[PDB]
Ligand binder design. Structure first.
Ligand SMILES: [Fe+3]
Ligand SMILES: [Fe+3]
Length: 689
């Protein structure tokens, strides 16, 4: 096959020649015979994957955030692993390993020389120039960074910058002539083994390299002495204090095979095979991560244990982290332009419908709330992650596919209520909705008892009343997981399309988008999947008490949700009984909490304080709600908020995903999801490491 060989990209001759010390020992041992490719600059290979002639490549992350913009398009396939055995650390650090004697501290890296591994590399630019950034007093509205990081350092050696426009910034560089301060190890001072070396002699001062690079060049312990570091708090510690002198935690280096078509699992297959065979501490007249004396870290960083496998939904922007997605962004983002996005929020509006209502409020705020518009909501809770959306209002199930993803509860869409009418709506706590299974009184041969083989209807796919409680109740008696079987043919807007689950949807009006977790899916939502039984598509349509109530008896608009008589529909109860849409009080499969908004616990605290504002202008008591604009109203379709909800209650405390849902109910999602594995839950509990 024109694909049964991995073309690795080599940037040297000795990394290209380790690659041949490697091409021999492999297919002999048995595996996709490795092709080794000739190249140079860091991108002449991030590009040669993007052009299809060089099929793999191992990078630092400050550079993998780069090989993953939209010009090229490469996802990292294998995270590189660090440390020693009882402790293999899959991420890394970024300190400033200085010589016992230079008395400056980090707040004093002003004017002195320097020593970066590289330009673009995390530990030595994505990490440390925003750590210092404040006195750079670099102007963007005039000059650039690599420009006012020249005014700061009287003399430094960051490789890859232009030797022509940044002289001061290619001065303490020891490379061969045209190879001087160039984007490769051709600059003897390029890397933790070029920037460390940048100081061990005295030429270059602070050396911004990881935590253990001193270690590698300086074997002797009576040698790790002459280097009091520099910490965040303006101090100094030994090369073994790497830990408290960190500046931040960054994922390690990764490997970059194209977004789609770079043969991602041949690339890894060579590595089923590398980590073991020539693993660290096994077969050696060729280690996998090592170049001979006088060359450092060719192919894979010297001394590193190896590679990891990254779960395809996690690519470029995604692996570097959010704590570090604050490094790579910060700088290319002006100083007045970084607050433009901190006194701002972004409403992940799922669709072209949930998106247009946003854009009436993107400016009805005066532009304080903008959009992050995906078309799933498993795509969108992911976007809450990537420094791309503050939050959004998810409904239970989704607070659990965004509860293993790190999202912890802010405000709750406490709708309007009567009990405890007493308080204030914010200060009035969650008196939720009672999940239900309504049918037509026409359906006399149906009571929960008789449900197997009849048709179904389920709001969206994971959620409460339209799934969790239903498919998580149709499993507690039953025994068997496979939810699609209990019911004849159903409409499940969000799951396997060609199944008996979407085997009953409608999509838009043209017929398209049959079965979709975005409202265009006609039979999607509490009101969409209430149409499901309300247009005889199904025998049942799992709902919220209030959906049989607010789309009949003269309440919608709607030519469907109008002529209906609510008292035409019975509420399938739990003891093989049946009560009107009325008696949904003793009857409901189960009571549940309203839908709260979800953003990362660093983005929590502000989306509280903006929404604790817009639920109060265009809030139901909004000065600007029935007249200027009502942030909750939306013609019986419900775009973003419960057409029902009154306010956005205060939840109090800091209730994790778990403690928000109810606990009993939480032990229900986990045990249910033991049956269908979502990919957003795959690479979300991979982001903690
Ligand atoms: Fe690095
Ligand atoms: Fe819900």
């Amino acid at each position: 096959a024109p694909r049964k060989n991995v073309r690795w990209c080599a940037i040297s001759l000795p990394e290209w020649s380790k690659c041949y010390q490697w091409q021999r020992r492999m297919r002999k041992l048995g595996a996709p015979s490795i092709t080794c490719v000739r190249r140079t600059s860091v991108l002449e290979c991030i590009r040669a994957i993007a052009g299809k002639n060089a099929d793999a490549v191992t990078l630092d992350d400050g550079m993998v955030f780069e090989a993953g913009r939209d010009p090229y398009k490469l996802r990292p396939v294998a995270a590189e692993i660090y440390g020693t055995e009882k402790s293999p650390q899959t991420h890394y650090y970024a300190v400033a390993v200085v010589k016992k004697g230079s008395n400056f501290k980090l707040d004093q890296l002003q004017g002195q020389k320097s020593c970066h591994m590289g330009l673009g590399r995390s530990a030595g630019w994505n990490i440390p120039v925003g750590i210092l950034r404040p006195p750079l007093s670099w102007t963007e509205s005039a000059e650039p960074l690599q420009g006012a990081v020249a005014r700061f350092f009287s003399a430094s050696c960051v490789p890859c910058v232009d030797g022509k426009a940044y002289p001061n910034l290619c001065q303490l560089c020891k490379g061969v002539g045209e190879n001087k301060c160039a984007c490769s190890s051709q600059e003897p001072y390029f890397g933790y083994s070029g920037a460390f070396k940048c100081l061990q002699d005295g030429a270059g001062d602070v050396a911004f390299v990881k935590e253990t690079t001193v270690f590698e060049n300086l074997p002797e312990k009576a040698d790790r002495d002459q280097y009091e570091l520099l910490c965040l708090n303006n101090t100094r510690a030994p090369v073994d204090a790497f830990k408290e002198c960190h500046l931040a935690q960054v994922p390690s280096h990764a490997v970059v095979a194209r977004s789609v078509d770079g043969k991602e699992n041949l690339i890894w297959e060579l590595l089923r095979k590398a980590q073991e065979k020539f693993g660290k501490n096994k077969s050696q007249r060729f280690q996998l991560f090592g170049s001979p004396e006088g060359r450092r870290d060719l192919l894979f960083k010297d001394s590193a244990l190896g590679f990891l496998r990254i779960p395809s939904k996690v690519d470029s922007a995604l692996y570097l982290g959010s704590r570090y997605l604050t490094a790579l962004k910060n700088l290319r983002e002006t100083a007045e332009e970084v607050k433009a996005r901190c006194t701002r929020v972004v409403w992940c509006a799922v669709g072209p419908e949930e998106q247009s209502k946003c854009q009436q409020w993107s400016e009805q705020s005066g532009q304080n709330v903008t959009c992050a518009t995906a078309s799933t909501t498993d795509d969108c809770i992911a976007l809450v992650l990537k420094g791309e959306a503050d939050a959004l209002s998810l409904d239970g199930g989704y607070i659990y596919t965004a509860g293993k993803c790190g999202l912890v509860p802010v405000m709750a869409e406490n709708r309007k209520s009567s009990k405890h009418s007493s308080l204030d709506c914010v200060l009035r706590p969650t008196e939720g909705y009672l999940a239900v299974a309504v049918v037509k009184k026409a359906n006399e041969g149906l009571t929960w008892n008789s449900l197997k083989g009849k048709k179904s209807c389920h709001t969206a796919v994971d959620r409460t009343a339209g799934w969790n409680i239903p498919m998580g109740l149709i499993a507690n008696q039953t025994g068997s997981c496979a939810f699609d079987e209990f019911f004849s043919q159903s409409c499940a807007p969000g799951a396997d399309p060609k199944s008996s689950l979407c085997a009953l949807c409608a999509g838009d009006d043209q017929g398209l988008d049959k079965c979709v977790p975005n409202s265009k899916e006609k039979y999607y939502g509490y009101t969409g999947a209430f149409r499901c039984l309300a247009e005889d598509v199904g025998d049942v349509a799992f709902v919220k008490n209030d959906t049989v109530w607010e789309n009949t008896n003269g309440e919608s608009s709607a030519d469907w949700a109008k002529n209906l008589n609510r008292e035409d529909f019975r509420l399938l109860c739990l003891d093989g009984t049946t009560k009107p849409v009325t008696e949904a009080q003793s009857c409901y499969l189960a009571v549940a909490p309203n839908h709260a908004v979800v953003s990362r616990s660093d983005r929590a605290a502000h989306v509280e304080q903006v929404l604790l504002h817009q639920q109060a202008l265009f809030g139901k008591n909004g000065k600007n709600c029935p007249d200027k604009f009502c942030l909750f109203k939306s013609e019986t379709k419900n775009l973003l908020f419960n057409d029902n909800t009154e306010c956005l209650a205060k939840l109090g405390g800091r209730p994790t995903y778990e403690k928000y849902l109810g606990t009993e109910y939480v032990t229900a999602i986990a045990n249910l999801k033991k049956c269908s594995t979502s990919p957003l839950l795959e690479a979300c509990a991979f982001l903690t490491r």
